Amino acid sequence: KDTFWTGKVPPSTVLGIGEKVPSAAYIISSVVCLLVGSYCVYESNLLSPLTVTTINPLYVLGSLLVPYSWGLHVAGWIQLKNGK
Amino acid sequence: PKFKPSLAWFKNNESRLNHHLAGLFGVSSLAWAGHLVHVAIPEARGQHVGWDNFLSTKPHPAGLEPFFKGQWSVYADGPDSMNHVFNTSEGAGKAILTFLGGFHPQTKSLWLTDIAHHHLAIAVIFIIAGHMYRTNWSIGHSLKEILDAHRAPGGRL
Amino acid sequence: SRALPFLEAPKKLDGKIPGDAGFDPLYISDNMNLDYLRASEIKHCRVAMLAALGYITQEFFHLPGDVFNEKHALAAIHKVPIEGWIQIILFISLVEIATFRTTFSFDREPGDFGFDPLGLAKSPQLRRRYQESEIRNGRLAMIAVIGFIVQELVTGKSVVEQ
Amino acid sequence: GFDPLGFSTIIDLRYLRESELKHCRIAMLAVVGFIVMQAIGQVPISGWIQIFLLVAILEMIDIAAIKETLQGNREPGYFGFLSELKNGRLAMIASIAFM
Ligand code: CLA
Ligand code: CLA
């Protein structure tokens, strides 16, 4: 696949496995991932300092939803503007 | 003749990157953390560990029980004291992985348990990073596809 | 493929050569020189089989003298005289140097150094049966001897005792 | 024809079938296993590692198998080894309740 594109909007095929996913699915999931991820970071690090005996694996895993939400909102915009 | 690699082998960018990230960097870093935990750190606390006895000598009394039970904080308990005399048991700890920061007071150098943990942590990141590119199983990225798509839509690039 | 009957075998493995069950899920054969790999497998087969036989026998039976009376195989290494080991090494060395040309020529057939003293493989059809069975016993011996060695390291007991 | 949400349009149905039949088979063996929490702890860690070490390899080979399915050289869930599917779906809902 040639992924080169012109104009203002990429053509959905840049999303790979997620090319057929609807715009609303991406947009809602991006908000959820950002809020849950932000909460994990807050609970882990900001609500009381992190200690050697207070590392929750779920909060560490959950923190990865913050960068993931970025990707989801870019994909959401791409689908929105492509009509999907 | 029968072992000269083809030009196609030399231009297999995705496979080379996967192996160099996960293997050459990642696994090498993991093996070095192994050396430190099994040999360097015991030797620093006055204990001989070599090829002769290393199969029978646990790096930590608890063994790998805490590891498989996810009780990883056990490996941080009991660091070398600030009065530890390097290459002796006087003031020595049991911890194999730590995040103390700064210097051992006697040797004026970074703690060995910090160095072991550094190498273990980056090994994980490197091994994960080396699953990015597409080889023989359809998952992963093409380098050509990433590059062709990176044009700022405003046209300044 | 046969060994993995849901997957397809790689292109190199057609099912003609001895030892071919189409077992190469990683598709190593696509990149690797197969002729040499076959020679390498057969070599590991033959070393493992001698090693497997050696392990079980020198537990029971022994060469005369106190030096060669160690039931544990891995404990026997340090007891046996160095000059004894040098002669075995020099012997193995001479064989490997003699055979080196053939190995990298790829003229003769993998594992074939023209060694049939007694003339057991007279017929080509018998040779085929023997060649497959060499690999089969060899593959089995390769696992077994690694089984034996690891077991000794773990337990500290000779194969029969444990 | 039961796909309200529409995953078969998003993701390939062959892949979803492989996932379905896998859940079905794991769940049923568990349902039978439950009948025939403490055992998670009681069993030695060495034994548990061997279970993981065999599920891995089988799952690594399943990646190569999924390739054949998605290329169209293999039936979804065939390892050369409706009743399966119906009983499987029931066992999956049952297995949650037991856990
Ligand atoms: C302004 C900055 C910017 C913008 C607007 C874009 C925009 C784009 N990028 Mg680019 N990218 C950028 C910076 C940017 N990029 C940078 C700095 C890098 C690293 C050098 C990349 C690396 C990159 C790659 C590798 C790819 C793109 C792709 C794209 C296109 C599709 C995006 C997508 O599919 O999202 C949807 C993405 C997701 C839903 C995934 C979430 C993001 C990741 C996974 C988070 C990281 C998680 C963690 C570290 C990894 C998992 C660990 C563990 C769980 C295993 C889009 C045109 C795609 C493309 O070009 O198609 C041909 C593509 O394949 N980008
Ligand atoms: C696990 C798989 C694996 C491994 C281990 C390697 C390893 C290597 N390959 Mg690669 N290769 C592979 C798979 C692999 N390859 C595959 C699948 C392909 C085909 C796709 C290739 C294709 C390929 C080609 C074409 C070439 C190589 C080459 C090399 C060598 C690079 C030179 C070197 O020694 O860097 C060693 C580098 C490191 C150890 C990384 C560490 C360095 C960074 C900067 C980190 C910081 C260092 C650290 C602080 C150290 C402190 C040290 C101490 C003094 C305190 C290296 C031996 C090259 C070569 O030299 O061949 C003879 C070469 O030309 N490979």
XYZ file of C-alpha atoms and ligand atoms in Angstrom:
632
model
C 0.000 0.000 0.000
C 1.199 3.502 -0.904
C 0.394 5.640 2.151
C 1.304 9.004 0.556
C -1.553 11.540 0.642
C -2.203 15.151 -0.390
C -4.495 17.874 0.951
C -5.684 18.252 4.535
C -6.932 14.769 5.547
C -5.228 11.314 5.472
C -7.262 8.441 3.903
C -8.242 5.972 6.687
C -5.848 3.272 5.371
C -3.146 4.902 7.549
C -4.984 3.441 10.584
C -3.939 -0.133 9.689
C -6.029 -2.713 11.587
C -8.331 0.122 12.745
C -9.220 1.503 9.282
C -12.878 0.344 9.338
C -13.537 1.460 12.951
C -16.199 4.254 13.159
C -15.416 7.840 14.184
C -17.650 7.707 17.283
C -15.939 4.562 18.613
C -12.546 6.300 18.453
C -13.798 9.624 19.832
C -15.608 8.165 22.872
C -12.823 5.655 23.612
C -10.248 8.478 23.496
C -12.084 10.437 26.210
C -12.462 7.307 28.357
C -8.790 6.336 27.935
C -7.608 9.864 28.796
C -9.743 10.050 31.966
C -8.953 6.530 33.217
C -5.272 6.987 32.366
C -5.127 10.380 34.096
C -6.801 8.784 37.133
C -4.226 5.961 37.226
C -1.358 8.466 37.125
C -3.042 10.525 39.850
C -3.711 7.550 42.150
C -0.244 6.059 41.628
C 1.961 9.133 41.972
C 0.052 12.286 42.968
C -2.316 11.096 45.705
C 0.500 10.413 48.205
C 4.086 9.718 46.969
C 4.972 6.443 45.241
C 6.732 3.906 47.501
C 8.379 0.524 46.893
C 5.407 -1.194 48.605
C 2.644 0.838 46.905
C 3.125 0.056 43.207
C -0.187 -1.125 41.746
C 0.361 -2.974 38.408
C -3.081 -1.837 37.179
C -2.183 1.846 37.605
C 1.091 1.259 35.739
C -0.806 -0.511 32.933
C -3.558 2.118 33.138
C -1.043 4.954 32.630
C -0.386 3.675 29.077
C -3.973 4.694 28.194
C -2.825 8.347 28.304
C -0.518 8.080 25.214
C -3.012 5.605 23.711
C -5.829 8.181 24.003
C -3.742 10.588 21.900
C -3.598 8.031 19.102
C -7.321 7.312 19.449
C -8.299 10.977 19.054
C -6.096 11.368 15.956
C -7.706 8.258 14.441
C -11.125 9.642 15.431
C -10.469 12.920 13.592
C -9.175 11.039 10.537
C -12.398 8.981 10.378
C -14.634 11.977 11.151
C -13.190 13.971 8.231
C -13.235 10.953 5.877
C -16.971 10.512 6.593
C -16.503 7.297 8.596
C 29.508 -19.439 -2.536
C 26.690 -21.263 -0.720
C 26.805 -18.938 2.330
C 27.003 -15.506 0.626
C 23.797 -13.635 1.685
C 21.528 -12.156 -1.000
C 21.047 -8.425 -1.536
C 17.443 -8.861 -0.331
C 18.725 -10.235 2.990
C 20.919 -7.136 3.412
C 17.960 -4.793 2.785
C 15.543 -6.515 5.188
C 15.274 -3.428 7.391
C 12.313 -4.532 9.554
C 13.837 -7.860 10.617
C 17.228 -6.297 11.357
C 15.632 -3.581 13.520
C 13.479 -6.090 15.438
C 16.508 -8.275 16.219
C 18.921 -5.419 16.992
C 16.443 -3.723 19.343
C 15.090 -6.798 21.139
C 18.140 -9.071 20.849
C 21.357 -7.093 20.458
C 20.268 -4.321 22.852
C 17.421 -5.797 24.918
C 18.640 -9.329 25.665
C 22.263 -8.163 26.042
C 21.028 -5.675 28.675
C 18.986 -8.410 30.400
C 21.982 -10.779 30.436
C 24.144 -8.010 31.918
C 21.572 -7.492 34.693
C 21.902 -11.264 35.188
C 25.690 -10.971 35.584
C 25.304 -8.164 38.117
C 22.676 -9.981 40.211
C 24.401 -13.394 40.152
C 28.088 -12.331 40.328
C 28.988 -8.645 40.702
C 26.637 -7.911 43.620
C 27.566 -11.064 45.670
C 31.275 -10.451 45.056
C 30.744 -6.882 46.310
C 29.324 -8.346 49.547
C 32.328 -10.665 49.989
C 30.729 -13.838 48.545
C 32.510 -15.851 45.834
C 30.220 -16.800 42.961
C 31.793 -18.394 39.888
C 31.178 -21.063 37.253
C 31.963 -23.642 39.968
C 29.076 -22.732 42.327
C 26.654 -20.395 40.521
C 23.999 -23.043 39.726
C 23.688 -23.786 43.469
C 24.016 -20.194 44.788
C 20.775 -18.178 44.816
C 21.219 -14.407 44.145
C 18.521 -13.789 46.776
C 17.395 -16.110 49.661
C 13.752 -15.978 48.517
C 14.725 -17.283 45.052
C 12.252 -16.706 42.195
C 9.206 -17.393 44.404
C 8.479 -13.628 44.858
C 9.032 -13.089 41.116
C 6.334 -15.552 39.996
C 3.965 -14.358 42.763
C 4.401 -10.693 41.744
C 5.863 -9.798 45.164
C 8.708 -7.941 43.478
C 9.228 -5.455 46.346
C 10.936 -8.324 48.219
C 13.995 -7.849 45.970
C 14.397 -4.229 47.152
C 14.302 -4.950 50.917
C 17.568 -4.563 52.835
C 19.981 -2.473 50.706
C 23.694 -2.152 51.456
C 24.090 0.206 54.417
C 25.938 3.519 54.135
C 28.734 1.820 56.128
C 29.150 -1.071 53.669
C 32.825 -1.859 53.001
C 33.090 -2.948 49.360
C 34.233 -6.549 48.789
C 33.200 -7.458 52.373
C 30.099 -8.530 54.309
C 30.478 -5.650 56.803
C 27.368 -3.491 56.302
C 26.204 -5.624 53.342
C 22.547 -5.921 52.281
C 20.409 -8.622 50.647
C 18.535 -6.475 48.065
C 19.298 -7.241 44.408
C 17.214 -4.423 42.842
C 16.862 -0.882 44.250
C 16.317 2.783 43.441
C 18.530 4.522 46.009
C 20.067 7.225 43.816
C 23.442 8.880 44.327
C 26.654 7.206 45.425
C 27.943 4.450 47.669
C 29.838 6.486 50.359
C 32.992 4.331 50.362
C 33.486 3.713 46.631
C 32.075 7.107 45.537
C 30.280 5.302 42.701
C 26.697 4.401 41.723
C 25.109 1.561 43.741
C 25.421 -1.815 42.005
C 21.782 -2.666 42.841
C 20.685 0.526 41.046
C 22.814 -0.444 38.031
C 21.290 -3.951 37.937
C 17.758 -2.509 38.057
C 18.613 0.088 35.376
C 19.655 -2.697 33.009
C 16.603 -4.855 33.747
C 14.230 -1.940 33.135
C 15.767 -0.850 29.803
C 15.949 -4.494 28.677
C 12.149 -4.700 28.953
C 11.699 -1.470 26.986
C 14.135 -2.577 24.265
C 12.493 -6.019 23.937
C 9.059 -4.373 23.594
C 10.440 -1.807 21.128
C 11.772 -4.652 18.953
C 8.234 -5.908 18.178
C 7.335 -2.758 16.240
C 8.231 -3.721 12.661
C 6.511 -6.231 10.362
C 8.449 -9.418 9.555
C 6.813 -12.779 8.731
C 3.479 -12.567 10.634
C 1.604 -9.538 9.224
C 1.472 -7.625 12.546
C 3.753 -4.598 12.924
C 4.761 -1.592 10.836
C 6.378 -1.115 7.439
C 9.121 1.531 7.573
C 8.222 2.641 4.035
C 4.550 3.099 4.980
C 5.399 5.192 8.051
C 7.710 7.464 6.051
C 5.367 8.005 3.081
C 2.541 9.093 5.424
C 4.469 11.738 7.399
C 3.549 14.960 5.636
C 2.237 17.931 7.637
C -1.209 18.702 6.086
C -0.599 22.471 6.139
C 2.111 21.821 3.534
C 5.054 23.527 5.279
C 7.176 20.357 4.884
C 3.229 -30.376 6.649
C 2.919 -33.587 8.684
C 4.369 -32.882 12.154
C 2.218 -29.738 12.326
C -0.728 -30.987 10.194
C -2.593 -27.637 10.263
C 0.348 -25.575 8.917
C 1.989 -25.841 5.490
C 5.662 -26.847 5.225
C 8.316 -24.438 3.800
C 9.343 -24.506 0.132
C 12.719 -26.222 0.666
C 11.166 -29.127 2.610
C 9.347 -31.105 -0.106
C 9.198 -34.481 1.709
C 11.897 -36.227 -0.374
C 14.962 -36.002 1.902
C 15.341 -38.343 4.944
C 14.041 -36.858 8.210
C 11.505 -34.627 6.419
C 8.246 -34.352 8.375
C 7.781 -30.751 7.174
C 8.730 -29.554 10.676
C 10.019 -25.984 10.324
C 7.369 -23.591 11.788
C 9.849 -20.670 11.886
C 10.872 -21.210 8.227
C 14.578 -21.326 9.146
C 15.272 -23.365 5.984
C 14.233 -20.419 3.765
C 17.262 -18.379 4.897
C 19.672 -21.154 5.971
C 21.785 -23.439 3.758
C 19.828 -26.686 4.080
C 22.571 -29.054 2.835
C 24.843 -27.798 5.630
C 22.004 -27.853 8.185
C 21.410 -31.531 7.341
C 25.118 -32.268 7.857
C 24.967 -30.366 11.165
C 21.888 -32.302 12.340
C 23.445 -35.670 11.411
C 26.676 -34.692 13.211
C 24.737 -33.748 16.378
C 22.787 -37.019 16.006
C 25.959 -39.146 15.917
C 27.671 -37.312 18.799
C 24.507 -37.517 20.929
C 24.033 -41.254 20.283
C 27.609 -42.078 21.349
C 27.115 -39.723 24.310
C 23.793 -41.354 25.267
C 25.322 -44.852 25.092
C 28.444 -43.642 26.924
C 26.375 -42.097 29.743
C 24.430 -45.266 30.611
C 27.328 -47.734 30.203
C 30.094 -45.996 32.177
C 27.600 -45.808 35.049
C 27.556 -49.629 35.192
C 30.793 -50.830 33.563
C 34.282 -49.374 34.083
C 37.783 -49.416 32.579
C 40.429 -50.872 35.000
C 42.092 -48.593 37.575
C 40.752 -46.220 40.249
C 40.797 -43.201 37.899
C 38.071 -44.700 35.665
C 35.713 -45.878 38.450
C 33.434 -42.812 38.718
C 29.740 -43.695 38.298
C 28.719 -40.035 37.856
C 29.429 -38.972 34.263
C 30.009 -35.252 34.911
C 32.238 -36.103 37.903
C 34.378 -38.347 35.653
C 35.663 -35.350 33.640
C 37.968 -34.013 36.376
C 39.176 -37.484 37.469
C 40.258 -38.791 34.033
C 43.895 -37.864 33.108
C 44.424 -34.676 31.079
C 46.788 -36.519 28.709
C 43.842 -38.887 28.115
C 41.594 -35.964 27.122
C 44.308 -34.432 24.892
C 44.441 -37.689 22.884
C 40.638 -37.740 22.451
C 40.676 -34.056 21.436
C 43.562 -34.617 18.992
C 41.690 -37.628 17.565
C 38.415 -35.707 17.126
C 40.471 -32.806 15.725
C 42.143 -35.003 13.080
C 38.763 -36.420 12.002
C 37.229 -32.933 11.699
C 40.208 -31.582 9.708
C 40.135 -34.635 7.406
C 36.381 -34.218 6.828
C 36.414 -30.383 6.543
C 36.747 -30.326 2.723
C 33.812 -32.719 2.188
C 31.567 -30.732 4.555
C 31.957 -27.445 2.633
C 32.110 -29.083 -0.827
C 28.501 -30.365 -0.762
C 29.405 -33.014 -3.355
C 28.817 -36.264 -1.481
C 25.527 -36.043 0.522
C 25.026 -34.787 4.150
C 26.901 -36.879 6.733
C 28.466 -39.076 4.022
C 32.216 -39.573 4.548
C 32.296 -42.987 2.824
C 32.223 -44.882 6.142
C 30.563 -48.273 5.675
C 33.265 -50.755 6.882
C 31.015 -53.825 7.159
C 28.927 -52.956 4.074
C 25.522 -52.915 5.783
C 23.943 -50.419 3.362
C 24.532 -52.428 0.173
C 21.141 -51.759 -1.444
C 19.991 -48.135 -2.093
C 16.605 -49.024 -0.557
C 18.276 -50.321 2.631
C 20.426 -47.162 2.753
C 17.214 -45.082 2.731
C 15.760 -47.059 5.666
C 19.050 -46.731 7.570
C 19.375 -42.994 6.804
C 15.905 -42.159 8.171
C 16.454 -44.330 11.258
C 19.876 -42.749 11.906
C 18.155 -39.348 12.130
C 15.256 -40.758 14.197
C 17.506 -42.420 16.796
C 19.778 -39.362 16.658
C 16.956 -36.866 17.272
C 15.749 -39.033 20.174
C 19.289 -39.308 21.586
C 19.796 -35.522 21.274
C 16.864 -34.834 23.620
C 17.748 -37.728 25.947
C 21.387 -36.786 26.600
C 20.353 -33.189 27.377
C 17.776 -34.834 29.660
C 20.544 -36.853 31.361
C 22.956 -33.921 31.825
C 20.342 -31.485 33.181
C 19.039 -34.194 35.543
C 22.552 -34.713 36.979
C 23.060 -30.950 37.444
C 19.699 -30.674 39.239
C 19.712 -33.830 41.389
C 23.326 -35.033 41.606
C 22.550 -38.682 40.788
C 23.562 -40.955 37.891
C 20.819 -41.800 35.377
C 20.187 -45.298 36.799
C 20.262 -44.287 40.490
C 17.728 -41.502 39.884
C -26.884 -13.659 12.516
C -26.169 -11.998 15.878
C -23.863 -8.974 15.632
C -25.602 -5.849 17.073
C -22.357 -3.935 17.709
C -20.756 -4.922 14.385
C -17.344 -6.472 15.116
C -17.523 -8.740 12.038
C -17.564 -5.598 9.856
C -14.628 -4.071 11.775
C -12.496 -7.202 12.339
C -12.314 -10.311 10.115
C -14.848 -13.028 11.011
C -12.251 -15.801 10.568
C -10.148 -14.176 13.312
C -13.207 -13.709 15.548
C -14.095 -17.401 15.062
C -10.585 -18.472 16.129
C -11.047 -16.279 19.223
C -14.542 -17.695 19.860
C -13.558 -21.374 19.554
C -10.506 -20.715 21.765
C -12.680 -19.173 24.507
C -15.122 -22.086 24.081
C -12.411 -24.736 24.527
C -10.591 -23.022 27.427
C -13.896 -22.380 29.228
C -15.159 -25.970 28.913
C -11.901 -27.502 30.194
C -12.176 -25.001 33.072
C -15.843 -25.885 33.740
C -14.819 -29.565 33.934
C -11.681 -28.516 35.857
C -13.691 -26.550 38.455
C -15.989 -29.544 39.058
C -13.203 -32.155 39.136
C -8.840 -20.616 44.196
C -6.646 -22.428 46.747
C -5.256 -24.660 43.968
C -3.829 -21.503 42.335
C -1.610 -21.160 45.437
C -1.251 -24.794 46.586
C 0.270 -26.119 43.330
C 4.082 -25.531 43.101
C 5.415 -22.639 41.014
C 7.644 -24.966 38.949
C 4.570 -26.927 37.814
C 2.664 -23.721 37.000
C 5.629 -22.514 34.892
C 5.472 -25.704 32.785
C 1.762 -25.069 32.109
C 2.585 -21.510 30.978
C 5.566 -22.827 28.973
C 3.245 -25.193 27.035
C 0.354 -22.740 26.523
C 3.142 -20.579 25.138
C 4.547 -22.359 22.046
C 1.011 -23.603 21.317
C -0.047 -19.933 21.178
C 3.144 -18.928 19.323
C 2.335 -21.630 16.736
C -1.267 -20.341 16.667
C 0.095 -17.037 15.292
C 1.483 -18.999 12.325
C -1.858 -20.866 12.184
C -3.901 -17.628 12.159
C -1.820 -16.539 9.135
C -2.915 -19.675 7.243
C -6.563 -19.059 8.221
C -6.548 -15.380 7.171
C -4.813 -16.309 3.883
C -7.386 -19.101 3.418
C -5.393 -22.328 3.875
C -7.034 -23.485 7.134
C -10.459 -23.698 8.801
C -10.805 -21.291 11.794
C -9.943 -23.375 14.877
C -8.560 -26.457 13.065
C -5.436 -27.985 14.651
C -5.813 -31.389 12.934
C -6.823 -33.021 16.241
C -22.203 -26.417 16.093
C -22.274 -28.795 19.092
C -18.789 -27.580 20.080
C -19.886 -23.971 19.549
C -23.247 -24.164 21.365
C -21.881 -26.113 24.357
C -18.830 -23.815 24.326
C -20.902 -20.605 24.492
C -22.853 -22.033 27.459
C -19.656 -23.165 29.220
C -18.199 -19.650 28.830
C -21.155 -17.993 30.598
C -21.043 -20.814 33.178
C -17.291 -20.389 33.780
C -17.728 -16.700 34.709
C -20.334 -17.611 37.349
C -18.031 -20.228 38.920
C -15.110 -17.768 39.004
C 2.076 16.006 15.592
C 2.550 14.787 15.712
C 2.007 13.668 14.913
C 0.778 13.530 14.111
C -0.374 14.477 13.934
C 0.942 12.179 13.524
C -0.066 11.569 12.654
C -0.072 10.320 12.179
N 0.821 9.352 12.435
Mg 2.646 9.678 13.362
N 4.193 9.663 14.737
C 4.630 10.760 15.346
C 4.003 12.080 15.307
C 2.719 12.390 14.667
N 2.054 11.561 13.871
C 5.839 10.586 16.183
C 6.580 11.611 17.013
C 6.170 9.175 16.011
C 7.304 8.403 16.644
C 8.586 8.697 15.906
C 5.094 8.726 15.096
C 5.091 7.316 14.720
C 4.032 6.814 13.872
C 3.916 5.401 13.461
C 4.733 4.191 13.733
C 2.699 5.482 12.613
C 2.287 6.812 12.643
C 1.065 7.002 11.859
C 0.408 8.329 11.781
C -0.883 8.480 11.040
C -2.004 7.663 11.677
C -2.136 7.846 13.201
C -2.850 6.667 13.843
O -3.022 5.614 13.236
O -3.332 6.760 15.203
C -3.901 5.615 15.839
C -2.881 4.983 16.747
C -3.197 4.234 17.813
C -4.623 3.972 18.184
C -2.084 3.643 18.647
C -1.707 4.501 19.849
C -0.278 5.029 19.851
C 0.762 4.116 20.524
C 0.488 2.609 20.397
C 0.946 4.485 21.993
C 2.230 3.883 22.570
C 1.936 2.766 23.573
C 3.169 1.967 24.035
C 4.477 2.770 24.065
C 3.334 0.703 23.187
C 2.557 -0.479 23.767
C 3.334 -1.190 24.881
C 2.716 -2.514 25.343
C 1.213 -2.417 25.598
C 3.013 -3.646 24.364
C -1.206 9.945 11.264
C -1.149 10.665 9.925
C 0.718 5.686 11.250
C 0.965 5.757 9.765
O 1.804 6.504 9.291
O 0.253 4.945 8.825
C 0.914 4.580 7.627
C 1.729 4.751 11.771
O 1.781 3.525 11.480
N 3.025 7.695 13.400
C 19.543 -11.678 18.107
C 19.854 -11.500 16.836
C 21.073 -10.758 16.406
C 22.268 -10.287 17.138
C 22.670 -10.495 18.575
C 23.013 -9.553 16.071
C 24.308 -8.882 16.316
C 25.053 -8.202 15.431
N 24.772 -7.983 14.148
Mg 22.909 -8.389 13.288
N 21.421 -9.220 12.109
C 20.418 -9.962 12.601
C 20.288 -10.431 13.977
C 21.274 -10.209 15.043
N 22.404 -9.525 14.898
C 19.380 -10.341 11.611
C 18.131 -11.140 11.779
C 19.840 -9.720 10.367
C 19.177 -9.793 9.021
C 17.870 -9.064 9.075
C 21.102 -9.074 10.805
C 21.859 -8.356 9.792
C 23.136 -7.782 10.141
C 24.032 -7.171 9.160
C 23.953 -6.907 7.698
C 25.144 -6.796 10.056
C 24.801 -7.205 11.328
C 25.850 -6.880 12.292
C 25.748 -7.274 13.714
C 26.833 -6.901 14.673
C 26.874 -5.370 14.890
C 28.229 -4.863 15.396
C 28.313 -5.047 16.893
O 29.022 -5.888 17.418
O 27.511 -4.209 17.732
C 27.494 -4.413 19.130
C 26.475 -3.445 19.649
C 25.994 -3.500 20.884
C 26.452 -4.550 21.844
C 24.962 -2.478 21.281
C 25.445 -1.592 22.412
C 25.924 -0.212 21.969
C 24.969 0.920 22.342
C 25.609 2.226 21.890
C 24.532 0.989 23.822
C 25.504 1.533 24.878
C 26.671 0.609 25.208
C 26.864 0.247 26.688
C 26.830 1.413 27.679
C 28.149 -0.582 26.734
C 29.158 -0.390 27.851
C 30.304 -1.352 27.582
C 31.407 -1.490 28.623
C 32.759 -1.207 27.985
C 31.182 -0.636 29.857
C 26.338 -7.601 15.928
C 27.341 -8.673 16.357
C 26.928 -6.213 11.541
C 28.211 -6.928 11.662
O 29.150 -6.369 12.197
O 28.333 -8.265 11.165
C 29.584 -8.911 11.280
C 26.478 -6.166 10.131
O 27.116 -5.648 9.152
N 23.592 -7.824 11.480
